[PDB]
Design a protein around this ligand. Structure first.
Ligand SMILES: Nc1ccn([C@@H]2O[C@H](COP(=O)(O)OP(=O)(O)OP(=O)(O)O)[C@@H](O)[C@H]2O)c(=O)n1
Ligand SMILES: Nc1ccn([C@@H]2O[C@H](COP(=O)(O)OP(=O)(O)OP(=O)(O)O)[C@@H](O)[C@H]2O)c(=O)n1
Ligand SMILES: [Zn+2]
Ligand SMILES: [Zn+2]
Lengths: 153, 310, 310, 153, 310, 310
């Protein structure tokens, strides 16, 4: 509670704001990390005006503080994004994602003979080599692929 | 009598420019005015010792559209032949005792040419022999290039896919080298490269060719884009899947394609050409398969008929 | 142009009373005066992706009696199609590039109707799609009822056998419900009962039907007795064998049957109709299968031909 | 003013506001009708207070008028949703969903032998209100199923 | 000697309440205080004329944890006995000269009882004979019910799935009906319902039973929920899919279950029990499969050893 | 306890230099002073979901020379588990109730690592999982290299054949790279060359390697020649035949080899090592196959026994 508006909507009473999501990544982050499976009030802004990116997305999840490694699961998709943690109308914390050492659940091994396809196991990849560009190794088949290839199917 | 009269169509390497132009000019006339009774009373054998449904159904509809009868077998589904050591020389010496032309596919390379030593005066047309030749797929490909581009020379032809094991790209490169000033772009993963004997033949004829990694590098200049299927056993699952499996066409890639550009593919395509490419003017793979009916009818007409009334 | 001209015959539910009467009036004329050259120069594809010999041999003799050529395959005996992930949308987009009508059987329900989205202007006639439809078996059944009973309305039709999984009784009940005042008797073991969606459609149309356990309860009133085969895998050995396996007709049961009554069965019959029934006037199952030749010739004539000279 | 309601909500100038989306169907509708594949401003609200009819969700999509056909597909999901267009700062039309003739694309045939499963086809089911439920008949296999059996799978 | 000593174990119908308790008593002792050289020097034959990897490995591990030696086979498309020529009776007459006991599984019913008339004094233990009996599965189910609930009577047992054809649910109802005061709830698709004979038996004993439609209806009063896999082949794909919101189990459905309620399943479970059930306290099908070792040890020990004092 | 006690043996990448030396140390002692009742009362399961007679018999003989009992299977066209319905995960969850250790070979990669998450405290040993790992082959290769050369570092090792796809050569290079100063020579057809990742790893460790074209080029500096079979299916018949005067081995080629040079091959050898090589002192592939017994005894002893003092 205070002013809201939409060009840069305003103030939730305690919770998390993931601001500066690239664009079209917001709904991916909602789907993939199933941030919606909450009874708390979420407010989401898609394709918004901004300083440098120009148009961006934002997600405000009240009463949940997702942190430390939840913020890192975001790094592959929204690396420049800030995760403001709010207590009592004040940003009592700003995080940025950093590359994790494990990305569970969200990816699909491109190797069609991998056993992970058919079974009640969650996908898991070891991650390596920051920003010259990322290789992911399946837990199970131990094949290493380029992240851009895993991120297509 | 026409030059192809009673010839055996076994290899592309045996047909001259003039033989390739004659066939393509005759297909053009049968496409325009049908001759439904031209092979009336002729009986043709359709021997597919290895099954290939697509090619059989087209070769036999072609025989049926010129009025001939067809007898024959599809096998590799044990229809009792090769039973008790019967040699191929002996099978053909008995089948040529009563049909007027043999059309055959066989798993070993060389088999249509051997049928030729045993058939007497019955012509043998080859529908595929192992990894060696397939003239009739090259004739329909050529016909489709001619009919959509207006010429068979001065083309900018890109060949994308598995160029190392794709029997049809190897024959089309040798047929297009018959002609003048064509330019080739080969875009293949490193493991599926166009073999040196093709490349060496091209150099020796002074024809220009080059390797590229992305169709984006070349789209703009391209008249014919002949895509091929990679079979994932030629690579391993993770190789295929890896940064190698993007030799696949989508509609968004054709953005800057010339108005005349066509996408051609012998088929089955499984995922190298995405389904959204079909709604574009450039998708010509199905129309390419319809053109197989007139390239094969023209070969059957020229081979069984000594004089044609054009 | 006739109403069926260039239509796809995919479901009984799509043909109106008038469409069913037209087909049945045309079969009647081709049965009486042959037209052996009516589809001359037409080439038809006979694609049975699932093998069904009885239906293939009749559909193709029908094509042969109107003068057309047939190309095609029987499979589920691996004749190389569906090889390397070729979709059915892509197979039909290539086969319709050169035949004039496609006749097809396929194991999945819905497949002839999908062929329709890809075939262009070549008509698709369905010869069976999984447990869904089979229009041509219902058209020959209807023709045989009309020709032996003189009408398709006011009939007393008994349906005996496995009514729950028999694809043909379900379609004939929906076709006969198109017509007036027919009455139905269903005689089935409890496990193989006529499904509720059929029964509900009958109630909603005010048509009369009833369940009986013995054909003896109903013989006297019955005009058409359509028997079906129970397949013993639908039950277990001892279930089949038990007091359930007496849905079988013998000659002694027809004692009080009306002079006009006929016994009909799509076939193979294995033991539900005993062999001594064949020598009776009432056995009309073989004559029913001969009538498949004219119901299918009439559909092929009306679909490929815009005007008929009756 | 303050009986919180809105907290200065995003009065859009021109567009579609879907309101009274029954809770948890909010995200469903975004996914299924791919409403975020647009570059215009969306502002979504999930698990908002329905002081009148449940708890609810609400999507505001600007400069977008989603009508007639589009509105009726939503009947199977949010039967209780009022669409409202806006052309210059207030409600120009307020439309309820009604069951359509057919539901295309979004829905899967329950029948595993249906051909639609393996092919480049889009689903179509004919809708019939069978006075208790809605029965959906598949175009392809022509099998009829309770809308409830179809909506999980 | 012990009552079962050197006895054939063919049907639950043949074992009294007391024989079932003696087995369950022994098996709890072999579980507690293992006896690894009890059948030292015995050769048991594992004749699986019908493959079943899971039942075969549990028996052979039982033979080996009591120190016995094992010879035998399995036969999907393989190894010669029974042939067609060789009778079962002669296979057994020959094998009962080699071994000390025979465990056999065969596809035709009563194959085990026929064996009994040819094995001399060699005991034969039935591991399944068609759709008739599977006593060692009922023996481990009752051990798991006794071990979890503490008793075998005054139980509220729910059985779910294919009740018409699960052989294990037929057997388990006869077995639990030798004890006192059990109440049965049978939740099945009415096409797959408990046959009238189990029911007619239950009534003579005065046992209470009821038929329900969803597990949700009884979740609250129930002690054992015995799930069975519903077999798609005896169903239509579309029948299979349209039953309610099914009869499959998920943890959401368990929020209601009593604290000591367990879910049993003979396995395999394809989809009727979801993966989330596996992590609740109520999940007991894997433990149930491990108790198979103790039930089958017990039966072998009592059959081959005269006086067993453990 | 010993470091590997009750540990899963899934990948070479997971075993340190020291773990590899502990295994090789134990295996030389079990070879010297055999201990036949070490696993008395253990039941090991031999789940070969992918048949391999030679690896299966070596493991089972290993289980039996240490006195263990064995239950299990192989599955070419046979015996039910995994089915399609039955997950691997449930096969393992069930089997890990019966046995004390699981040796498994499966066709999809990582099947072994998935097993690990379902076997409780039951160790699983990977006998091959698709194209990923085969640790017990690398363990016996290193035992044979150590046993013949006297050391595992400062070796001049040559690897020949299909380097792109031999899983054993990928593993053996990672393993020999935990030791110091090894020089690698990789003689492969450039279509079948060592993948860049083995090479990129070798460079970070600073290990020296070179790529050659014929064994003749290195015959003289080499200590181990590890031959691999070249797999004709990933080759064209004509490609396969045209490589140089090949990369096959004959005794003529060995006239040059050092006195302590040995030729290793995981087997089968079809034609790359001629019969005359077998009679020279350099032939060591059969001895290599016998050391498989000692490497696999060692791994089983350390996994199942806490403190092993031999
Ligand atoms: N109770 C509040 C307070 C702030 N915000 C959000 O917090 C985010 C960023 O925090 P802030 O430091 O207050 O604004 P910025 O300076 O823009 O932070 P940054 O520079 O990291 O973007 C803003 O998007 C704002 O909407 C919020 O939703 N609710
Ligand atoms: N410029 C405007 C005007 C209205 N609205 C939205 O349009 C919706 C329409 O509701 P309205 O007719 O204004 O009053 P209600 O009584 O809430 O409508 P209903 O009867 O469906 O509850 C409101 O949710 C409001 O957010 C908007 O976003 N921008
Ligand atoms: Zn993987
Ligand atoms: Zn369907």
């Amino acid at each position: 509670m205070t002013h809201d508006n939409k060009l840069q909507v305003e103030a939730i009473k305690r919770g998390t704001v993931i601001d500066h999501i690239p664009a079209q990544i917001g709904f991916k982050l909602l789907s993939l990390f199933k941030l919606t499976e909450t009874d708390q009030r979420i407010t989401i802004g898609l394709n918004l005006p901004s300083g440098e990116m120009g148009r961006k997305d934002l997600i405000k999840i009240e009463n949940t503080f997702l942190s430390e490694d939840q913020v890192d699961q975001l790094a592959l998709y929204a690396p420049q994004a800030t995760v403001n943690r709010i207590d009592n109308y004040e940003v009592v914390g700003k995080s940025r994602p950093s590359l994790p050492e494990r990305i569970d659940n969200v990816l699909v091994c491109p190797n069609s003979n991998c056993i992970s396809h058919a079974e009640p196991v969650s996908s898991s990849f070891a991650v390596r080599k920051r920003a010259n560009d990322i290789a992911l190794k399946c837990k199970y088949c131990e094949k290493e692929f380029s992240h851009n290839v895993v991120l297509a199917n | 009598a026409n030059p192809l009269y009673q010839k055996h169509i076994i290899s592309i390497n045996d047909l001259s420019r003039d033989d390739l132009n004659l066939v393509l000019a005759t297909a053009a006339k049968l496409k325009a005015n049908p001759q439904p009774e031209l092979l009336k009373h002729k009986v043709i054998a359709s021997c597919f010792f290895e099954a290939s449904t697509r090619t059989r159904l087209s070769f036999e509809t072609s025989m049926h559209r010129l009025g001939a009868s067809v007898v024959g077998f599809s096998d590799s589904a044990n229809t009792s032949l090769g039973k008790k050591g019967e040699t191929l020389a002996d099978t053909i010496s008995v089948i040529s005792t009563y049909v007027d032309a043999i059309v055959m596919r066989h798993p070993q390379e060389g088999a249509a040419r051997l049928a030729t030593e045993f058939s007497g005066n019955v012509p043998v047309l080859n529908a595929g022999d192992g990894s060696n030749q397939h003239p009739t797929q090259t004739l329909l490909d050529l016909f489709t290039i001619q009919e959509t581009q207006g010429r068979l020379d001065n083309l900018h032809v890109a060949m994308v896919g598995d160029l190392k094991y794709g029997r049809t790209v190897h024959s089309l490169t040798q047929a297009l080298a018959k002609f003048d000033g064509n330019r080739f772009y080969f875009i293949a993963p490193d493991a599926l490269a166009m073999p040196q004997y093709i490349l060496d033949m091209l150099d020796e004829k002074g024809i220009a060719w080059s390797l590229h990694s992305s169709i984006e590098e070349v789209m703009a200049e391209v008249d014919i884009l002949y895509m091929t299927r990679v079979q994932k056993e030629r690579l391993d699952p993770s190789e295929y899947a890896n940064v190698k499996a993007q030799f696949v066409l989508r509609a968004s890639d054709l953005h800057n394609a010339k108005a005349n550009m066509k996408v051609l593919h012998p088929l089955p395509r499984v995922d190298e050409i995405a389904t959204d490419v079909d709604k574009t003017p450039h998708a010509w793979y199905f129309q390419q398969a319809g053109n197989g009916i007139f390239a094969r009818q023209a070969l059957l007409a020229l081979v069984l008929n000594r004089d044609l009334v054009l």
